[PDB]
Design a protein around this ligand. Structure first.
Ligand SMILES: Cc1ccc(-c2nc3c(C)cccc3c(=O)[nH]2)cc1
Ligand SMILES: [Zn+2]
Length: 208
């Protein structure tokens, strides 16, 4: 039931999504090991993901969470990188998209920094890099990230350097406590608490 609608680069929606992608790049403590060495992207395409059934599943859960949290869903737009993006846009998020070994337990992980989500496009730790060249810093191959609508509800704050949400909470927030330039990461434990709204196709750019 999924269709993908191409956005024009002249569309304000394309431009605001691209700006969020580009402006949330940062340097990573691995010196580029997992995601590659870059300061910006070449955005090739941005598609809107349209699936009525998946959207209704999201909004149903969002209403449940809102009602448990003084009419506040605490909805964010966050990045998700995964080798399973093609499954996710067709069938939705579920337990198979969880990071079993994540620092906040087995849940589905999202990032404010697009460059954090970029580290996971080819697998955990970048896997073995792109399928074609086996290069985690490949500047040729096309990569894809999701820009997702995510319901956090009442989020458990973890200060730091599928399972269940902590009791009385709907998500976990991983607050950076060492790297002053890192943005937060978030974990949900129910696939219905995210909708994969934009599919972004891109390359990382080699710095000059
Ligand atoms: C199988 C799989 C594991 C982790 C990810 C993933 N992890 C993230 C973490 C740990 C922090 C911030 C963002 C992400 C992310 O976008 N995907 C995606 C798929
Ligand atoms: Zn490649």
């Amino acid at each position: 039931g999924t269709i993908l609608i191409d956005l024009s680069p002249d569309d304000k929606e394309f431009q605001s999504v691209e700006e969020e992608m580009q402006s949330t790049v940062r340097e990573h403590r691995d010196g580029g090991h997992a995601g590659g060495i870059f300061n910006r992207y070449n955005i090739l395409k941005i598609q809107k993901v349209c699936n009525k059934k998946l959207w209704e599943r999201y909004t149903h859960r969002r209403k449940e969470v809102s009602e448990e949290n003084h009419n506040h869903a605490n909805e964010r737009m966050l990045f998700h990188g995964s080798p399973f993006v093609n499954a996710i846009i067709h069938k939705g998020f579920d337990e198979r998209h969880a990071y079993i070994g994540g620092m906040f337990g087995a849940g589905i992980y999202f990032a404010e920094n697009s460059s954090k989500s970029n580290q996971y496009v080819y697998g955990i730790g970048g896997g073995t890099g792109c399928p074609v060249h086996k290069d985690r810093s490949c500047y040729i191959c096309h990569r894809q990230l999701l820009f997702c609508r995510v319901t956090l509800g009442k989020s458990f704050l973890q200060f730091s350097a599928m399972a269940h949400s902590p009791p009385g909470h709907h998500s976990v927030t991983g607050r950076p406590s060492v790297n002053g330039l890192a943005l937060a990461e978030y974990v949900i434990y129910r696939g219905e608490q995210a909708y994969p709204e934009y599919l972004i196709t891109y390359q990382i750019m080699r710095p000059e």
